[model samples]
Target chain A: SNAMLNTLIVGASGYAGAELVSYVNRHPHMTITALTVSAQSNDAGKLISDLHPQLKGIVDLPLQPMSDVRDFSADVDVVFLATAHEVSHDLAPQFLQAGCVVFDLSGAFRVNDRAFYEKYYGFTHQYPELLEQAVYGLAEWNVDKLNTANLIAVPGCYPTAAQLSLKPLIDGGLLDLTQWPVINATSGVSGAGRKAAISNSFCEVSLQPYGVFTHRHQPEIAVHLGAEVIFTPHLGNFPRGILETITCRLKAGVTHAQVADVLQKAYGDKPLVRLYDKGVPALKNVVGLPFCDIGFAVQGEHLIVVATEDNLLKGAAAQAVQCANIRFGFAETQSLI
Target chain B: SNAMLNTLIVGASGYAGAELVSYVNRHPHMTITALTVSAQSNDAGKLISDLHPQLKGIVDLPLQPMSDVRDFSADVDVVFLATAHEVSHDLAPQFLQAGCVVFDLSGAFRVNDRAFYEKYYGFTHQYPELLEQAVYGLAEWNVDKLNTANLIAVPGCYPTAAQLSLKPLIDGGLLDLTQWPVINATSGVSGAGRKAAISNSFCEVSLQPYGVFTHRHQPEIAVHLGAEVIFTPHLGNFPRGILETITCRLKAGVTHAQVADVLQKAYGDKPLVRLYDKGVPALKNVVGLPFCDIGFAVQGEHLIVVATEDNLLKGAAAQAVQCANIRFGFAETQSLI
Candidate 1:
């Protein structure tokens, strides 16, 4: 029997961070050693379940403030970085050097290009080598790479559904390349993080697209898909999940059957992806689940593909745990389902 | 001069109905005579403010059951029908016969075609003549008709933003007829109405498109705009507001500046329609406000116009009250702002 790995979660006060706590607690091979917030965080010393009342009786672990990485790194076997991009950029390397396997939920090391951080992320990346070493943790697509990766850079909430919906068609040469795939996606306010911004407040949320031609996820999706897309992300009024309505022009000869065959071939054995034969998937179907539910409709040469997943689950924490399960040779969906 | 026109709000338990009560209460020239619900409604005797705690201390009017329209219509000068289509179909004419100016918020009187109700609304229209007499209350566009009409058909939530975004461009002959405007709008759960269904439950909502090509609002929008459109409405997880992302192909010679000029000329002094000079409107900007905020971006011949409004407010109640204001010679935005 394998000894359980002691995991420490950084930035455990946010929405996605709380999800990581729930899944990691239930993960048989993993044992949560600590849940840490920033030293100055007002949420420090409060119980994780107290901040997120849904987890009250399930996991009432106290959240400690991490003033120094060395304090907990010595006893931790794995580290989950749910911190801000800049904080994760600095702390990920520190945890890595301390011999802890890191699964970062931030955009700190997802893209290898140093210029990506400078342009889109508004920060100059210092560790070029670590960026190269970090595996893109898209779970199903990068399973082989994650098997040996110490630093897994989990995909963003918007990119997860966007890539899952388009990648199969792009790989099979089913789309007409003249017009870029127009992705109009909406995410619940929780995707804005668990911050108290006026824009994301309960009464302040509406469904409107932001980051029109220029969003950090646009490049991340383009780099991964190897095809340019007109990705528009909207901040919706809800608390969690993401639904992407992707419009694409299919090749003249491509039939609905051909597209279905490609999707079945791509995710036939993938347990995390739920494929619908008919009727497009709604956000309600997959909001609380770990699965990415995809549905599509084809008319003439136009195809509208819909994909939905919980912004905090399949988008972030669930994908992180899924990658960790593969890395340790455990059941791919052990704790996720 | 008008001795405080006594207004009675029917269906006061609903999301939009409550707004009608609030606005009518504050109207300087209007008094809320009574708030009515269906005779069988469980919320019959409850205080309107109890159901919607936001109005707790402000308006604590009781929701009386309307077993007989004659019970309340005798003393009422104006009637706001915030009931279902079938209920409004029967009640609206009854109130009008009792000499009350009726503003029907339901789709019962919005379209003049009897077949529209039979096909989309699942009812046989008994009052075809009333439908013809009811003015389409898209406040900014139909003010003249509203001035003399006894029956007013307030526009549906989706149609309000969809028309507000496209009508100006279409009127200016800037859009290409070959390609129909594509309206991708996502509305809050409140748009689905305040019902106890698994679909609108707090845990069940995710952002996903529904009523794809078959929504009743599709025909309502196309008929009102005098142009064809691919209207798609999505039910988001939020509580209120509707945001429409409209894509249209402008005529070859039409510049972005010309499109801007036409919109400014149409709504330059319209207090209810907040026009944006630059930057698209976000849902947050109009969720709690009464105005329909519109913004746009033009690239080449492709134009994307974004319009947002509180689905319960400008889309229904506020628009209804605005029509009543026009009918009574009150300020266009009285008790609305």
Candidate 2:
């Protein structure tokens, strides 16, 4: 266990997985013991450095074919499955039975109800037994449960930012439950993934609102806020940052000062959440950092909450590492600036 | 008159003046015999088409120095002072005394009061005689006056669209005068002129609001609207077209049908004012055309009016030509379609 706390990652070629490798290389507590590519993939024997040019000199381990987990399952202390939901659902139990702690980066085990996962992720849950044991990895909010769990389900990118910002307001019962909160969020093109496509092409977008009526993030916002919400996601003409302009009608008597006090009470102790004194947060301030800058203005009974975060950092990779740090009892923001 | 209209244009090298020359050349009624350049300009003696590549084949006239304007005054039929306010204030009277009809593009004669011109345009009015005689050229509204006037003052781009859409509302006495209208207008890069500067640099701008409290066009809007207003102009990331989103609180019991009725009644006969039945006008629909598209939405007492027009077309040169057509009894949209 002293030999860099041996770790193996399945699905080591995606945006999130490559980011994980980058973070792991920089982390002083852990080493990426082995990286796994698909069995039929021609990229199985290539060096991990080749896949991500940024990690060329830092992480030079060769990727192994993920044909059988039993071959290398016993050697590693933890197995991180960054594969598809179905693949994680089928393979996570196999890694766990080999006496290795499993961290599943899929919706296969995030929601406790197996049917809910099937409904949203569009896959029938095969491993219902692992659902109750899986810990939700909203690092800052649910740290106690994350520390002792054998299997952790890393939260999705949209869910991480949305839940972090709205959960405190919902728990405090600050907003009027009558009308659905209108979330007009704009994210950089990278939220679509690193894959090349015409829609994600640089020349195609011009900073306009899109995904007006339906987006997958809607359900995530609804579930976390415990309220009916109309979520609209826009693709901005930027390379990074997610700016969510959330509009909500507060309970009649709630004042602007009260809204500030509630948010202050919720995130005052947290180092990562930056609340501005005046003027809402702009995407330019938080595009490259892990900090979630929250600013709000109240006009009459309606409140506008502006939240900004780096879509890939606080929204995806850095958040997973934050949860990982919390689980290992390491200093929070160890790998974060 | 048979010798053809010998014209002198001050500030003949700017974006607006360049566009004016391009239009005036193809007109059957006028001949551009001489073009005047700014005294300090290095562009003197260069072909008019050299500044704008679009006019390469059409216009072959060379720009003459400002000193030649007084010498050629006896031959010229019309003089267009497209120069700055101070320059126009000093030069227009000389051209006017020469018995030539002068069309001033600057704000020199737009505002009647000397102090108002001084406050808004940042210069003292030197030609109160010309200001009294100058016709306010909102072509459609003042066509008859524009026909015989010796001097005409063109409305600013923002004022043109705002006045065209809201004039009928104000003149009809359909809205309360106490409620200040809030006009949120977005203009293309060309509105900042053809000058290459750091702020107008393409990479530096992302879509957002600017010019909050004081824009020179605010007074023009207020003067034309017949009521005080809060006007904000934003610079959109595009080449041309201005989209004005005007918000105003309507008088009590003022119905949406009433607003629509007055708009249609005023603009229904006008060829250039396209009134939309349902959706708002986009920048794409009016980018190249010489038309003002008006659309409105009402939610209780709050009224939202959307007007879009090409900044260079309906806002400047085309409107000037429209006034010229009125002066000569030609079709309003002649040579402008």
Candidate 3:
């Protein structure tokens, strides 16, 4: 089976888009067809490896400026939009119309609500019908939708982690609905900038909470999990990993064995989600990997699920590639360790 | 007003002890009467400044061999035992009998339960009555107890970070105890101290959970918070500061305003504990600072409280000084900031 999906990655200048280019280049079933940034970007002509040193000598692709979507999307079988939310919103439709299976790594079409786009995203969505058509690229949960999807909207970093940690319990009816899950997620992404930028960033404020109740990811997490969750996001000192500690009230008489069974059965065959049977997971375990390492602890009626993922890997780029693999019917974890 | 308290810093050879020396050395109302280590320690007879380079120029105190409490307790008005648990258990009683107020930075005297000492701690406690008499040095909550006490047992690092975040909500009757509060705390390796010299490369690969259900701080948090807690502790790759993200199911009808108001009222008068009305605390904001900074977010019936404290400062040495201040009627935050 020598099936190679020609892939065009949009916004290849940033950290996230760099990972997408790297992942697509390495995947046996996916070929890097084109790399691009917005027409006005100064990064358009620079080598991707120059901007992203982690990919030095590994990826030797130039960032092409966007002129016309039809120009790049013509022969491309797949398009990964790692551009800004508004940019992804404008680009995904053109690529989809050009007969490409689009995986959007931005918050462009993830949430179907029109008012949410206007309220949080600062622009009213022009494609409500397209939003209705796009599959939420949560990899493990939306496999069937991803297989048939032309426009796949990848979940945000926080929502990806918060949902992954809670969906198993929610689906099993293990959590008490009256007591909504409280999620405290930490991202050590200051290192995404590299070297001195990382050292000086965390020194000023070791860890901080941002976008508390007003975060866009909060609504996204709640809507997908089908349970109202109190999501609190924090910024830590680490360079790349996202560690989420989600606490929920388990249903009455739900023993530890019941929790163990639910999590085991849910992620048993899921290639990307690693489950810890004993202790909780750490950021160190999941960093630089496409897997969401999950570990949980239960006492009486309360359960705390500890999950981790690399912000660029599982959260953004690797996730987009994971969905592409599903859409093309390839091995779920191909090119993702 | 030269109201000096003659202080003897027992086991002044580690990071926590170094901070104790630094704080007591700078404090106007306190004088460093003597510095010591257990006679068997290799650190004995060494200059504390030599072992702890941060105090190179400021402190020139020698770590005298501790033959007996009587040797250094002659005219010592206050004693801070930063020794091993068993060592503190033995030394605290002798110093207290010698007419010195003992502030023990050890788990030896913290829990009053004999079974806890036998289960969590290796030994069956020999001094149960002394455990009963020891005042828990949570500083803010146990001020009155600390004022009249001779033997003050300081809260452990993880417990200090966890309790500060949960106690405000618990005291305000906002939490639903049916769903036990779950605390996930990450501590830096500063407390891991001089025992192992970890290189920068070592830190890059070092964030993991060690003691899960069996951690000694879990029971200490439960006993003091007056609520059963599921505590999961992790060793982060950072050098200092502990950030604890605590999640709890709130009682029905508890609003975001109610949670913030409770935190404000609780920490309004306390200088050592800072409260954020809007956002959550970051470890960067409180790192190397004496304050236990707290911030929270609430939605529906779920509440998340985040707090941070330096392991050596608020977690250990600074808290001991804070207790000493409350005990001896000095400014509560004296020399702590």
Candidate with top lDDT is: 1
User: Whose TM-score is greatest here?
Assistant: 3
lDDT of 1 at B123: 87
- Clash pairs (backbone) in predicted model 1: A241-A311
* Model 1 interface RMSD over true interface Cα atoms: 2.1
Q: Arrange candidates by DockQ, descending.
A: 3, 1, 2
Identify the runs in model 3 with alpha carbons over 4 angstroms from their true place. A1-3, A190-205, B1-3, B197-201, B204-206, B249-264
Best model per DockQ: 3
Model 1's TM-score against the true structure: 0.81
- For B20-117, candidate 2 gives per-residue lDDT tens digits of 88677767777786777876578889988888878888887888877645676887887777777788888888888888888888778887788887
DockQ of each: 0.40, 0.10, 0.55
RMSD for each of the candidates:
4.7, 7.3, 3.0
Candidate 1 or 3, higher lDDT? 1
Reference-based TM-score of each model: 0.81, 0.65, 0.92
Relative to the unseen true structure, what is the C-alpha lDDT of residue A115 in candidate 2, on a scale of 0 to 100? 62
Q: Ten consecutive residues with minimal summed lDDT in candidate 3 chain B?
A: B197-206
lDDT of each: 0.88, 0.75, 0.83
Q: Tell me the lDDT of model 1 at A5.
A: 92
> Candidate 3 chain A: minimum summed lDDT over ten consecutive residues — where?
A190-199
Model 1 agreement with the true structure over B94-139: per-residue lDDT tens digits: 8888999988999999888999888899989998888779899998
